Design a protein around this ligand. Structure first.
Ligand SMILES: [Zn+2]
Ligand SMILES: [Zn+2]
Lengths: 237, 240
């Protein structure tokens, strides 16, 4: 909607495609010239992408495109899992309003409808979209804006987002099968929160993030053509 | 680090001179600080990245509002992230040189303590505590982990020695540093032993020292709250 927001989209696209490679130094004026836009939205975009974690600030001014390896991707997924586990634990310890529980339980019920009678019968893209909703609701459940922000910050890297490892091209039997266990975890997270069992809520929500890690390991081992389909992984490989 | 504009703007936010909910714009903020536009523009962006300001839709910024429950949540996030750094160092293994670096800090921290329970070099401990926590964030050797721990420690009341300014040198707090120092030793021992679950449990529990001391300030020393630079901006229960 804003010049700044469009600058963020264009700059993110250029970083993800490798047009602005890892290690490239970026400055407000020269980046505005490269994007063919005004200095002001570029200043905002460079700051927002530093908050997002695609860029680092340079000492003395300016920015630098971050470089990422597969070990960085694993660490980013682990941080998301740790923060989602914290949001689940605090919701369990503090208690959640019935309306907020009904909202997330409705998402869980819609997610159950993605599954059929055969093991690989899963509406993959439908699950990926509802999964995004479930994880946003989980981040907000305990009612703390400080917690919600931190969870969303830990989910902001292109490969760290909750459905990053569910791109449409990854709709294969091995990935569909893995969603059954992942959906049982969604149900267990909500049950643990309803039961006020914080240690369980944390353990399951953190373990849930290992589904994306295990699917990344599967891509490397058995389906390397899929690596380029996950946002941010094409340049790494 | 954005020079004097960042320092001046941060100081004004922390003292409550620019209160929570105040809208800030580049040009009018530069006029208020009597500083040129360029460093002020950069400072507003840096302080949004640090988490003290939010960007407004359509341009400009807004000072965030914080209550004591927000401070507790921020300390909890720092503890959770420090626990993650300790767990990953335990699981992955640390080079002997990196362990010797953090162990040297632990030994210097032990030198802060005398034979009487009250005998503690409070300011010396506060300074070396910052080094210990920065070293812990870096121990596993992952730049992703190090950057995230530092980001979770960027709010003024969330930093590892935020509650240890010179003006907070009181009996209950000096006495609390002894148990805190035993936790520093237990974190390192757990990492050396490759016991990740222990490393995480102790490092996360360590952050509850700042939480317990905040609860003590509210209950027994409310005069300290306003004298702790990172707590002056907090809105109390009656006003938040
Ligand atoms: Zn999920
Ligand atoms: Zn400490």
């Amino acid at each position: 909607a804003t010049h700044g927001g469009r600058a963020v989209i264009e700059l993110r696209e250029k970083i993800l495609s490798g047009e602005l490679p890892g290690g490239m130094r970026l400055f407000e004026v020269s980046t505005a010239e490269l994007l063919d836009i005004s200095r002001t939205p570029v200043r905002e975009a460079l700051s927002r992408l530093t908050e997002e974690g695609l860029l680092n600030r340079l000492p003395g001014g300016g920015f630098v495109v971050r470089r990422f390896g597969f070990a960085d991707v694993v660490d980013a997924i682990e941080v998301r899992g740790v923060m989602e586990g914290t949001a689940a634990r605090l919701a369990a310890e503090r208690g959640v309003s019935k309306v907020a529980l009904e909202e997330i339980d409705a998402t869980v019920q819609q997610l159950d409808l993605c599954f059929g009678d055969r093991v690989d019968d899963v509406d993959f893209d439908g699950y990926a979209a509802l999964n995004r909703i479930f994880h946003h609701q989980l981040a907000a459940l305990c009612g703390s804006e400080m917690i919600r922000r931190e969870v969303e910050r830990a989910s902001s890297l292109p490969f760290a987002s909750p459905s990053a490892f569910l791109p449409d091209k990854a709709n294969i039997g091995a990935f569909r099968r893995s969603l059954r266990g992942a959906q049982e975890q969604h149900k267990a997270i909500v049950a643990a929160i309803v039961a006020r069992e914080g240690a369980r809520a944390e353990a399951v929500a953190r373990e849930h993030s290992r589904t994306a890690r295990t699917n990344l390991e599967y891509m490397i081992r058995e389906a390397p053509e899929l690596i380029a389909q996950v946002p941010g992984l094409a340049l790494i490989s």
